[PDB]
């Protein structure tokens, strides 16, 4: 548990966080077609 910077490459951090955003936003779009707000 070092505070050492650069231990996990920033490109991996960016890719994983980026995919996280895509997933969360994807879920929100799914919700537009299901349950509340779907018009159905």
């Amino acid at each position: 548990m070092m505070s050492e910077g650069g231990r996990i490459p920033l490109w991996i951090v960016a890719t994983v966080a980026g995919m996280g955003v895509i997933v969360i936003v994807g879920l929100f779009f799914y919700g537009a077609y299901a349950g509340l707000g779907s018009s159905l």
Binding site: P9, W11, I12, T15, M19
Partner: peptide
């Protein structure tokens, strides 16, 4: 449903995997 999400993660990981693998073995990136 789960089959769809599993194919997504597998295909999705593949690109970053090629990059990660080459970065590890000092490849011609």
């Amino acid at each position: 449903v789960i089959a769809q999400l599993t194919m997504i993660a597998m295909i999705g990981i593949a690109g970053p995997m090629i990059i990660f693998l080459l970065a590890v073995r000092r490849g011609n990136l």
